[PDB]
Design a protein around this ligand. Structure first.
Ligand SMILES: O=P(O)(O)C(O)(Cc1cccc(-c2cccc3c2oc2ccccc23)c1)P(=O)(O)O
Lengths: 274, 270
């Protein structure tokens, strides 16, 4: 049930300086969307793996990772914590060890849990790898407005900063979806890149838009970026029809394709009178 | 390393078994081919003891030029309609599956593919070449429909298609096949596949600036300074390319080879 999950995510978040109620709320809202969409496809691999779709311990863990990502994003974008603290935190999460600075016990707790629950431990090292990649991508995008990046470099970094690769890997880790052997597949790698680019753009259309408008003030940036979103969605579809991926990968990917951020992140923020 | 005109005649001798083949196809193929071989020659000298493949082996060289000539010819068949839709499909099936062409007039197809299979150092490169051929073929036609769509596609789709249509993957794969450059193993790396997409994107953007990116963007977003954008993009891909090449040091002759392609000008042969 929703509020039990939100509160367990929230409770863990108190061991993270800068954590906000919204980080836990956006996480459970997005996570629930993904888990229920893939539920039926997840029941079939359920006998094989023994990983039960409604395993409370697995759900809350998946939501915590999601909250972790939203939090890190804000930390990076809003200065919620200092740059020294962000470095110690990212360093810890990237190796799966406790943070060296006080106030971030949640890093040790979550990585320890992920290690323990890993179906195929190769997913755990991959998640650590994806975590380091995410951190660097967040850094890079930030250092980019403090000349400019090209649309191509932006999108290349954006694919890593949208963290869809981390989301999929955490799902594989908890429900034994064998992403570790699937990624060796060129076409799987290619759609993962497409789905991410779709995510980065869907979000920014709520930054690529500003980046472009500054470079080419006379360019119809919004129409363009909207055509790019349509384009990627079409390429994503073509490939989806020409490749067959074991359950629940097909649904998972399409589930990520439809999830608009309006269902998460930039919609959730604590209320104030104003 | 075999004289230029003799190589041209060698290529032309085979090209004559392909309907629509023109003298210019053989010439361009030898020109581009020589440019590439000259720039990776120091490396190939180094790997030749291990592989037994001589940088100057005339059989290897002409075969490489014949494949380039095949690619130039196919582009023209597609763009200028040198052969019928039916004939192009039959040719693309033969070259893409590695079997004889089912329609007459294209004997050169089965002949070239058979030599490549036979000459392959690592036969996985031959299978990869058939795959790249299918990708190239599909991209040439899809790209063709575009200047006739009324419903042009996104820049994303254009570049993705242009990466395949520029054929650098085919060139690299054909070189690996003939000189034993172990491309099938290097592809296991994520960073190698990435530089492959990058250098191809660079080739597509360069050829177009000099289905076409400019024409596409201009008539879709007419107020956008498309040429400014594209040049930025190209410098963008170039920076990314240098990055990866620097980080991972690919075995010889891949560095010199990728470098040579980033620098090659469609004007040096076309
Ligand atoms: O498929 P498109 O017509 O879109 C294009 O990629 C062109 C092309 C036509 C014919 C052959 C090739 C290709 C094929 C074989 C060899 C070589 C090719 O490109 C180069 C460059 C340098 C050396 C050899 C080759 C590329 P373009 O960038 O010139 O439009």
């Amino acid at each position: 049930q929703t509020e039990r999950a939100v509160q367990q995510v929230l409770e863990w978040g108190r061991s993270l300086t800068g954590f906000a109620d919204e980080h836990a709320v956006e996480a459970v809202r997005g996570g629930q969307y993904i888990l229920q969409r893939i539920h039926p496809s997840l029941r079939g691999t359920s006998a094989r793996t023994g990983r039960d779709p409604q395993d409370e311990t697995l759900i809350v863990t998946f939501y915590r990772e999601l909250a972790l990502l939203f939090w890190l994003d804000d930390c990076n974008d809003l200065g919620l914590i200092s740059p020294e603290q962000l470095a110690a935190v990212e360093q810890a999460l990237g190796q799966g060890v406790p943070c060296a600075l006080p106030g971030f016990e949640g890093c040790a707790v979550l990585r320890a849990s992920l290690a323990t629950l890993a179906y195929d431990r190769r997913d755990y090292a991959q998640l650590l790898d994806d975590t380091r990649c995410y951190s660097a991508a967040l850094r890079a995008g930030h250092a980019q407005a403090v000349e400019r990046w090209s649309y191509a470099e932006y999108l290349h970094n954006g694919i890593d900063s949208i963290a869809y690769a981390n989301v999929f890997c955490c799902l594989s880790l908890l429900w034994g979806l064998d992403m570790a052997t699937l990624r060796a597949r060129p076409a799987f790698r290619q759609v993962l890149r497409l789905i991410s680019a779709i995510g980065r753009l869907q979000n920014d259309l709520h930054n690529a838009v500003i980046l472009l408008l500054q470079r080419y003030p006379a360019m119809p940036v919004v129409e363009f970026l909207n055509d790019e979103l349509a384009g990627h969605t079409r390429m994503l579809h073509r490939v989806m029809a020409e490749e067959r991926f074991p359950a629940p990968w097909g649904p998972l990917i399409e589930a990520m394709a439809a999830i608009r951020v309006q269902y998460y992140r930039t919609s959730t923020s604590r209320y104030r009178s104003d």
